[PDB]
Design a protein around this ligand. Structure first.
Ligand SMILES: O=C(Nc1cccc2ccccc12)c1cccnc1
Ligand SMILES: [Cl-]
Ligand SMILES: [Zn+2]
Length: 313
């Protein structure tokens, strides 16, 4: 007694299977999922005929398909993706000021601000999984994209992540190869030291939120025990992300693209998103407020860029 089903790792390439309806999916395929639901311990029902089940990439055909689609060989990746999807499928993705947001659930505030940020910066993903899911998220169906971020970042639904760390992981899977940064560190004692950064390290800085201050210079520790000055010589990138420990900061309309605000304590706080459009909009999941001025505990600010060369000699 049998039905026909299809197994997959990428939901595109299907593998015809004939399953014994007296045995679990588990006994025939190993761990098995139906649109995120774990059916490993369940026996085939007739309503399953012709349906697609996810399985683990446990032969060379599935390994090649999984790597080509996801760009990861982490063995627990597919199970993490399916477990998250089972939750993200039931989140709400309301359109807020023309952007896909996420209604608050399960500490997902860091994800909502990350998703809102992506839709305001020029970025293309390398893994087809992220390309296809990000296209759907932009159209309003973000369940797959959210599940993939959770899986790539090794975060479970319910865990509060850091926005900067999350953007860092997503940038590693994006085409930032054109991006270039040149830095100069001046110590009165020790003189000068020029650094070039490439890719992800060229678009991220930790220590100040102000793109203008980065250009004029910021004080950092030197090994000699003095304070050295670091400023921006040259930048080629479509955006920059300036990050700092959360601290009261004033966001001025028209001077930035968007920003992330973090309120509260370590691992038990809340992120909000601020976008600079015709005014300052504060997007907090499904919630929207406006103001002409904004002050809060800002962690990250995104700025547009193309090409910058310092006048500092
Ligand atoms: O401390 C946080 N984020 C961070 C911001 C800036 C610098 C940090 C340095 C080390 C660890 C966390 C940092 C944090 C804690 C809980 C939830 N989300 C974020
Ligand atoms: Cl993309
Ligand atoms: Zn020095």
């Amino acid at each position: 007694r049998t039905i026909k089903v299809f197994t997959t790792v990428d939901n595109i390439n299907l593998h015809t299977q004939v399953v014994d309806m007296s045995m679990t999916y588990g006994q025939q395929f190993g761990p098995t999922y139906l649109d995120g639901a774990d059916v490993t311990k369940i026996k085939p029902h007739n309503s399953h005929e012709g349906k697609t089940f996810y399985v683990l990439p446990n032969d060379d055909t599935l390994r090649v398909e999984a790597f080509e689609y996801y760009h990861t060989t982490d063995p627990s990746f597919l199970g993490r993706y399916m477990s998250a999807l089972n939750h993200t499928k039931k989140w709400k993705y309301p359109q807020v000021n023309g952007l896909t947001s996420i209604k608050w659930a399960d500490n997902n505030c860091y994800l909502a601000t990350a998703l809102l940020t992506l839709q305001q910066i020029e970025l293309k993903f390398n893994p087809p999984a992220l390309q296809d899911a990000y296209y759907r998220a932009r159209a309003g169906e973000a369940a797959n994209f959210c599940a993939l971020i959770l899986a790539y970042c090794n975060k479970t639904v319910g865990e509060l992540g850091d926005v900067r760390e999350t953007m860092s992981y997503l940038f590693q899977h994006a085409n930032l190869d054109s991006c270039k940064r040149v830095l100069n560190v001046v110590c009165k004692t020790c003189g000068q030291q020029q650094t070039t950064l490439k890719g992800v390290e060229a678009v991220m800085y930790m220590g100040t939120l102000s793109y203008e201050q980065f250009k004029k210079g910021v004080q950092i520790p030197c090994t000699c025990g003095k304070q050295a000055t670091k400023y921006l010589v040259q930048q080629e990138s479509p955006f920059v992300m300036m990050s700092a420990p959360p601290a009261q900061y004033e966001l001025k309309h028209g001077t930035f693209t968007c920003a992330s605000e973090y309120t509260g304590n370590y691992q038990c706080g809340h992120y909000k998103h601020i976008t600079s459009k015709e005014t300052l909009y504060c997007i907090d999941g499904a919630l929207l407020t406006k103001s002409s001025e904004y002050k809060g505990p800002i962690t990250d600010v995104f700025y547009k860029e193309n090409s910058y060369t310092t006048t500092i000699k």
